[PDB]
Each structure stands twice: as structure tokens, then as C-alpha cells.
Amino acid sequence: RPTVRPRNDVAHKQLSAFGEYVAEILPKYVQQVQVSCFNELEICIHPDGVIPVLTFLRDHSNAQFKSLADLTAVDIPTRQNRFEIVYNLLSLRFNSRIRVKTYTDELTPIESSVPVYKAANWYEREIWDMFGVFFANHPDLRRILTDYGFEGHPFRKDFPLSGYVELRYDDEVKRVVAEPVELAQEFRKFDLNSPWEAFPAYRQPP
Amino acid sequence: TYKYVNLREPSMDMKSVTDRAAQTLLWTELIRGLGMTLSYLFREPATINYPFEKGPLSPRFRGEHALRRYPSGEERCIACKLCEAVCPAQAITIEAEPRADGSRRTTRYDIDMTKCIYCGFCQEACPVDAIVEGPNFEFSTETHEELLYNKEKLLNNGDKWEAEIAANIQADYLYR
Amino acid sequence: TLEGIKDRVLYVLKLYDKIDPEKLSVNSHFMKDLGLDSLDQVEIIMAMEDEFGFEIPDIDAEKLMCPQEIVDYIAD
Amino acid sequence: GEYVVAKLDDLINWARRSSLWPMTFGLACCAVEMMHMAAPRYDMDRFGVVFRASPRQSDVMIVAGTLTNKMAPALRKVYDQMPEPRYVVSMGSCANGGGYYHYSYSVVRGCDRIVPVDIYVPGCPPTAEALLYGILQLQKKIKREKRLRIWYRR
Amino acid sequence: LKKTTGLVGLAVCETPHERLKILYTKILDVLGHIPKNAAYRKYTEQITNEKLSMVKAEPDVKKLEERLQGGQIEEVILQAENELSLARKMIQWKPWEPLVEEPPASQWKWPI
Amino acid sequence: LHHAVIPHGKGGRSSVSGIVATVFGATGFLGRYVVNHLGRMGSQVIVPHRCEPYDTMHLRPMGDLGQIIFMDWNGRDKDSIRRAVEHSSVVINLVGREWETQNFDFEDVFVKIPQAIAQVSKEAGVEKFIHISHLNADIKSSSKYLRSKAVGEKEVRETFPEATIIKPAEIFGREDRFLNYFANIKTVKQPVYIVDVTKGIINAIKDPDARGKTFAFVGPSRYLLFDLVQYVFAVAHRPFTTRDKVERIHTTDKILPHLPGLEDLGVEATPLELKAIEVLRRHRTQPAKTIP
Amino acid sequence: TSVKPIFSRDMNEAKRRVRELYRAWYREVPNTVHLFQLDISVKQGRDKVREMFKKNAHITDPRVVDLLVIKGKMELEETIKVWKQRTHVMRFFHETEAPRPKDFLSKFYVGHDP
């Protein structure tokens, strides 16, 4: 079938088997394990398990996930714990990838993973800057992307696209000043969603 | 499959050691580098004599926008707003109403040329080849306001450039 | 020197504008009598820190709520 | 007498447009196309436009890329240190008016909010030739200047 | 003995066989302090014993590397050190214990 | 109100203040502040200029796209004045020179030109006219500068009776020729801050009770010229010009109690002591005694 | 109602961190006014610092207080180390923002906003 992406059952089984393997070894922290239809393994863990679970995946002989590919966050306001923390790891030894996910809210710190992966340093600063998630015991937690003195965390779903302040040069004070944002043309919100269901396979029970 | 870029053991025979000593003292590899830049001195330069000579372009080139007409002179645009919807930069602003003869036509068609990313998505989305990116790339201005195109400006661009635009569309439409 | 210490405390406090000079007495509570707030007391302590040239920690400073404790505190 | 003033304007105007030394803020994508303007095909140096000049020997600032709020104060400081006469060329949609990031919380919506701008080069990015057209248009603007003619009439 | 491992910072090992026996023995010693019915102990003893048997049963390093499938023998030694370090930490974390806390009801539901 | 000039927005750069202003003399010291405050709130500003466009470049960032419009004009050409004012609701005249030139004497900048602007503005139907005069304007002054300011101040009041006339004292500020004048080197002075004068002008545009009035803009304190110059040198960390200019600096600042001032437009005068360092910091390589 | 603490385990410990931060800010203002060549007085700088603390006086959550102090320390680090420029320091004073009307009538005259 030329237009349909082919399945790979061999990889699906291997990843499923390793998913059970991880969950048997770390029952204290693993809450859910799933493999996607395009064969990506996700471990969902209690936030207490960050250091133990990441250390096990880095150091264990059947894991050896030596490379932290990415660390980011997702904001889902409807959840009690709105922030989902995502670790994407790579194992060169076994030519495999794994995703570890945990959660936190505005006021609950997450343990910094710099001790496991030195790559985590700047990623956690970016998560602090863009989402406002505090990482405990970080060697140097501060903003990395936003302007100095910037207020708020832009990547939160409830932060407006254009922010609250805009800059310009002011001649009277001979410097760049910040002022409440006004737009000559407001961003035009589009309602694009079709009112007809697209994917029956994902229908949520009513 | 892999190869080593820099895994080699220098020979320690006296003939080779003296070869490296001569290179160190006589600067031979530095002299070799001088030859390369010398050989360029006597090569023809690649420079072209702009604006009397122009860099080559293809019929697909994405330049200044224009609104086109049918051969009769009727506007091609029917205010469908597909260009405005797809525009990645929201650079297009359209308003429309029935024309005096009842035709479906725009009363506003603005492109903020300083929002536009010159991506060509508008001309892909257009069902009647009304909005195109033309071949002109020499329209820099002295003021910001001059780059806020309204419908009159865009229609004038179409009348100004149609001779070239039509030929470019003729050469590429079978790839679309 | 105990009256010498005591004099300096009143010297610093007089300079502190927020304290009405007449209301001030050596046994006046900052927050009951003189009507100062928490951070007003913090600024007073930093002034004493400067006058007597030593650092007064927060645990120690939180209890110095009238000039007498300050005079008493320095002496130790 | 007015004949003298007309010819001195021509002389100083000719010298200034014939020796335009630019400072480029290579902020983003558009910096690549100014590099291609310096490259052999277009060779901006052949017009008298040296490839790179220090800010204090510069005559024209070319803002080539997106100006963020974080960078805006630094850009203004460099403009204020330019000896006069000084000109600004805004190159690309981002610098012209914010472009594809116009609605961002972190982007200045056009560098003309920070410095005055003499030439606006459209495109995302403008081709190296389009930038060269804008530079030659700035030369013609300098050719029109009448500083001494106006001075003599104060 | 090979001249280099090919990996910057990973030095050649002069006596890899005896180094691996010492490390694998140490790992098995540490795993004895873990409860007998913890999956980490059962699995880690199983793989450690498999590698230990191959080390004792093959005197030629490059034949041994071909059997271990762990890259250079110096990489296998480093991996043994990593497992030993992990095993010690596992005793403090005790991850074989029950799940500390359930997530909220919709914590992992997607799409919302 | 014509629909185009009804105010909208929140008073920022992209808002619509409803003011359409022609500012003569906008390329000078006072003009740059006036245009800035107009463009801050989204006013349409027409800038007639006599100088090179290069010399108007600092005004362009002061307004959103399209809000600052530039025009050529000649002080002696009434048609060029008519072009600049026939669409405006307020005309502001800031034209002046502190010295005379071969082509323009004080009677030109301070009488003939202001009168022509006022007359053409009257004919074109402009509702409001704001004319800057001087506190010490006086036909018996030893200064030809101040004598002309008095003659022109009278001709504007006669030509455009509803004009708001503003009489500032010496204005100090970053680009002034006052504090800077001393730093580049009997009498009581009452200098006023540039931003105060600008705010007064802006509030005069809005205040309907300001029409037909004459204001004196003065600072909060009076100083002896010697005590002021001493303070300037102290602030500039320095060890302590035409003939007409010297006469002005030695003219005592009049005290006109009957005239309304900055407090009658809602503006609090800024003490010199707050802003002197701002102006004099660049000159670096005890507050002055005030008259009660 | 059991939650993971940030630093403080109760409001008393949180308030100690607040006072340490206030002291650090209070002592840094004279240096900031000098290094950044500000045109404000030291009194103005300290009055601004006190204003910023006061608006957060009503907090009773030690975790929220902890975050406010964390952000306050980062803001102080940017100032002490001169990562900020003069424009960033002066953004606390809104020198170009004309005062918004506060009473009902003034807001009624200018627009529709509450």
C-alpha cells in the first residue's frame, strides 16, 4: 500500500517487552508504560522517581541510555498537575530511544537531573524560563531565553501570544522603554476545527 | 562504514625526519599555500556587473506580489479568502461585498509586505491564479508605509508586470 | 561605655526620619508605640549594623523591638 | 556664489556615497544574504562598500535579521556611537516590521521603533541582489542631499 | 595489546580479563544485599553471571569482545563500573517497593 | 467631531488621540519634546521643515506608521504654510533663533513668520493656535530678541484672537542653551524644565478654557544668576555667544502674578535640583540658594 | 493538604528568607544608582524596593513566598552582576507612561474599560 506507513511488529514487541522490564524493576515509581503505533516507548513515572529512574536507564547494562536527547515541558491547564515533564533519551549501545514523563504544578519543585545528565543544565533553565517550573538543586537556575526582568512564563497556554509589554526607543528619556502592548492590527483568531469527528479510533467514551 | 580522518603514524626514518625538518625551517607548506592564492590572482573573477548584469533566476521565483486579471480585464480574485486563511504571517487582510453588477469581489485586499515571508502559499492556495508572487525584487522603499500594499497598488502591480507574469506562469503551470 | 553605646543607638534612631523624635524613648516598642512596620525595623537594624560595625543576624534581629534590647544586645 | 555651494555639495555627496562603510548587525537569516553580497558574484567592495567596518568608522548600519526586545537596547547603543553622517538600512521583513514573528511577545515590531531608517529592503530574505539594489538606492539618496545649499540659506 | 581504544579519554586496559572478574564479582557481592525477590537483583545477577561466564571461558580478548557485544573491552569494563555504581544506589532508593503514589485520575489521559 | 478624529484606544502609540497638529519649528529643542508627546498618544503630526530631511530623522520613531508627516515650507511663502495647516485642528508655532542671520533677523522669526502662520491658520479655519513667546518679552528691553518677542506676541493676539500664548522662562534640559551655555563658559532667574513646558503645551491643546489665554511657564524656584552659575560648575565637577544673548541672560525673570501658570494646566514644576545632573552629567570629565 | 515544600516548611521560615532578601536589596540600591548612573535618588530606589515587597504582603502560602523570593534573588543577581542594562533597571519606574485615570468619572470620559 504505497501511501500508508508500514508497521514494524518486531520493534513493537521489543519495546513492549522492555517496557515491562523497566516497570518490574522500578515498581516504586512507574505509573504507566505504553508503546505508540509508530513504536515509541513512554514510561510515565511519579515525580519522585526522576533521579532513580533516569539513573537506572543511564547506568543499567540492559539500558545504557547515555544521551539525553531533549528535556522539555508541556502545559495542559485542565490537569491538576498542568506541567508534563518529558525526557527523551537515546541508547547508542542498543540503538534505541525511550521517553520518560512525569508531572508537576506551579508550586511543586522537580529534582534537577544535572547529576544524571550534564546536558540537563540548560534544558531545565529553559523549562524554568518558559514554563516557570522550579528545579531543585540546580547549579544555576535562572532565565536563559527571555529578556532580563521579563515577567511571566511565555509558553504557558494562558500567556498571551503577544505578551503584555512592548519596547520602543523614547527620545525624552534617551533609552529603550517598555510600555503596555498595543497592536495596529490585532492577531486574527481563527476557528478552524471541523464539527465532524475525524478519528473514530480515538473517540473518548461519553 | 567509517574511515579515520587523522590516524596516521609519521615515519621515523632519517630521510623522513629530515623532510619534516626542511618543512619546518624552509616553510615549504606555507609556500605551497602562497601558490594557491597566486593561481587565483590570475583566474577570471566571478563578479557580475550589476545593475547592467543580473543574477539568473527561474520562472518559479517568488518576488513582489500582484493581482491579476482575465483577458477581458475582469479581476480574477473572487474574495474566496483562501490566501488570507493559509497566509503563515497573517499578512493578508480582505473585505468583500457584492459589486454593483452583483459580482463577488473584494473591497479591501491588503498585503503588509513587512509581515510577509514571501513563501508563495497564497498563490498556491488561490483557485483562480488571482494573487501571484511576481518576478520583481527591486522595490525597496524609503519609508515603512510604502510597503503596506492595498488593492490599488496590487492591481497596478498586476497591470505593470502581467506581460512577464503570464509567461512565467506559462512555463511552470504544468509542474503545478 | 554602656551609656556611650546607649547614646549611639538614640543617635541613629533620631536620624531615621520615620521615627518622630519626641515620641522616642529608650524603652519604646517600635511596632506598638512608634507605629513602625516589619521592614522599618529591618532598616533600623542595618543602621545599627553600620554604626557598630558588626553583622546582626535575622534570628538575633527579630527580637530587638525597642532601643533597650539594641543597647542590651550590643553589650553582649 | 550659489554655483560654488552647488558644486561642493556634489563633491562631498560624491565622496560620501562612493565610500559607504557599513556596519552589519548580522542578527539572523538575512545576515547570510549580506554575506552573499560581499561574496565574489556581487562583490560589494567594488562599489566602495568595504566588507566589514568597525562601528566607529562606519557610515551605514544594516539591520539584517530579527530584532528581539533583549537585543534592542544593544542595537540602539551601537547606533548612538556611530559618527555622523550615519544611515540605517533595514533589511528583511523581521527588521522592516517584525515579519513572521510580528505577533511575538519577544520581538520588536520593526527596527524603526528603535532607530530611524533610511531604506527598507523587502523580502524574507531579500536576495543579495535586492540588498545591493537597496544599497545603490541609499547612494542615490545621498546624492540628493543639499546640506551646504541649505546651510547657505539659513 | 592494542595501541588505542579509539575513544578519547578511554585508556587501554592491560589486563582486561582480571579487571572484569573483579568487577563482576563485586557486583554479585553488592546484589546480595538486595532482597531476593526484587526484579533488579534477579535480572542483574542473570546478566552479570552470563558475562562472567564468557570472561572465564574465553582467553582471547577479541574473541571475548565478539561474544560480549559491548564494543571495546574497555567499554565493557566501564559498563561494569556503571552497573556497580548503580547497584549501590539501588540499595538506598529501594525501587522494588510498591508504587509511592497513584496519579490523579486524568493525569495521563490524552487527548483531553 | 468628525468620525475620523474621535479618540480611541488606551492612549498609547497605536491609539487615536483625535489631535491633528502642525508643529512649526519641530526640528529644534522644544519641538522634539512636543512631537514626542504628541506621537506618544497617537496623534497625527504634520512637521513642516526648512532643513535637510537628514535633520528630521530623529522625529520618525516618535509616531506609529503614518502618524508623522513631513512637508517642505518656507517662512516667507504663505502657500507652503497653507498646505501644512489646512487639515489640522491645532497649530503650534515653535519657530525661533537665539541669534540673527544674514537672511533672518529677529523681526522675521519672531514677528513676520508668526504673524503669517497665525493669519493663514485663521483663514484655513484652524480652531486652536498655540504660540510660544517669552516671559521677559518687553518692547523696552535692551535685547532685540525680547523686543521682537513682544511685538510678535501682540500681533498674534490681534491676528488670531483665540490663540493660546505661552511665555516660558529660560528652559533647561539635555539640549538646552542654558545649563549647557554656562557649562561651556544682580540677576534673578526662574528657569523651567523642558518636560514641564512640553506638558503645559500638550494640556493647553486639550483644555478648552486655555483658548484666548496667556500663560507664563516658570520653575518652582528663583535663583541669583551668580548662585545658579556656581551650582552648575559644582554639578559639572568643574573648578569655579552674542551680545544679545548676554543681555537676555542678565535680564531678571519677570514676576507676572496675574497670568496663569503651569499649575493652571495641571503641571507640577520640576525643581532644577532634580534634573540638573541629567543635563550636566556629560559635562563631567550643594543645592543653590533660592530667593524666598 | 500535604504538599512538597520548596524551601520553607512554614510561613515563619519563609518570612526569614523575605527579610534577608529585603536586606540584600536595600544595601544594593546605593551601588545600583552609582554603577548604572541612574537619575533617581537612593531614597527613590529604596522606596521602589519597599513598594515591590509591600504589594505581596497578603501572601500566606509559604510555597508562593518561596517562589517570590527565588524570583527576587534572580532579579538581584541580574542587577548586581550588571546583566541588566540601564533600561532594565528603570523599567520599575514607568517614566513614559502617563498616569491612567483611577476614579469612575475619568475612566468614563476616556473609554469603556472598567
Ligand SMILES: CCCCCCCCCCCCCCCCCC(=O)OC[C@H](COP(=O)(O)OCCN)OC(=O)CCCCCCCCCCCCCCCCC
Ligand atoms: C657551511 C655552514 C653554513 C652555516 C649557516 C647555515 C645556515 C642555513 C641553515 C639555517 C636555515 C634556517 C632558516 C631560518 C628561517 C627561520 C626558520 C624558522 O624559524 O622556522 C620555525 C618557525 C616555527 O615553526 P613551527 O612549525 O611553529 O615549529 C617550531 C617550534 N616548535 O616557522 C616560521 O617561522 C613560520 C613563519 C610564519 C609566517 C609565515 C608567513 C611567511 C610565509 C611566506 C614567506 C616567504 C619567505 C620570504 C623570503 C624573504 C623575502 C626577502
Ligand SMILES: NC(=O)C1=CN([C@@H]2O[C@H](COP(=O)(O)OP(=O)(O)OC[C@H]3O[C@@H](n4cnc5c(N)ncnc54)[C@H](OP(=O)(O)O)[C@@H]3O)[C@@H](O)[C@H]2O)C=CC1
Ligand atoms: N529654549 C528656550 O530657552 C526658550 C525658547 N522659547 C521659544 O521657544 C521656541 C523654540 O525654542 P527652541 O526650540 O529652543 O528654538 P530652537 O532654535 O531650538 O528651534 C527653533 C526652530 O525654529 C526653526 N526656525 C528657525 N528659524 C527659522 C526660519 N527662518 N524659517 C523656518 N524655521 C525656522 C528651526 O528650524 P531649523 O532647524 O530649520 O533652523 C527650529 O526647528 C522659539 O520660539 C523660542 O524663542 C521661549 C522661551 C524660552
Ligand code: SF4
Ligand atoms: S507569500 Fe506567504 S507570507 Fe506573503 S502574503 Fe503570500 S502566503 Fe502570506
Ligand code: SF4
Ligand atoms: S487572491 Fe485568490 S485565494 Fe485570495 S481571495 Fe482572491 S481568489 Fe481567493
Ligand code: SF4
Ligand atoms: S526577514 Fe526572513 S530571512 Fe530575514 S531574519 Fe527574518 S525570517 Fe530570516
